[PDB]
């Protein structure tokens, strides 16, 4: 951790001198609330058949998408106050902040 620097590191290491890894790449996310897993620490809700969540059966993500999200693409309402650039800048910006890897 150098005493004086003019530029950012590529990895973000050393931006916070007190906690050098804060903001750096390939490190766990911070948590604003504790995790809620089916077994308390790893299994996700909807993993075990029959296991309710907070007293109610877990809805299938695709069923929620089907009954709440699905709409006729003929009926699309265009945002009269924003351009498609507003959308694209969001995805570009999202790709500066976070990427959650999975295995292969």
């Amino acid at each position: 951790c150098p005493e004086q620097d003019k530029y950012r590191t590529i990895t973000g290491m050393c931006n916070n001198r007190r906690s050098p890894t804060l903001g750096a790449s390939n490190r766990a996310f911070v948590r604003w609330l504790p995790a809620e897993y089916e077994d308390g620490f790893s299994l996700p809700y909807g993993w075990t058949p029959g296991v309710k969540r907070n007293g109610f059966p877990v809805a299938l993500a695709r069923a929620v998408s089907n009954e709440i999200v699905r709409f006729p693409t003929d009926q699309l309402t265009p945002d009269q106050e924003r351009s498609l650039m507003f959308m694209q800048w969001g995805q570009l910006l999202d790709h500066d902040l976070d990427f959650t890897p999975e295995p292969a």
Binding site: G12, G23, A28, A35, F41, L97, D98, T100
Partner: peptide, 14 residues
């Protein structure tokens, strides 16, 4: 440990 995920990128707008 309670399962948590990884950010492979710098959080900074850099």
């Amino acid at each position: 440990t309670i399962r948590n995920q990884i950010n492979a990128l710098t959080s900074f707008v850099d």
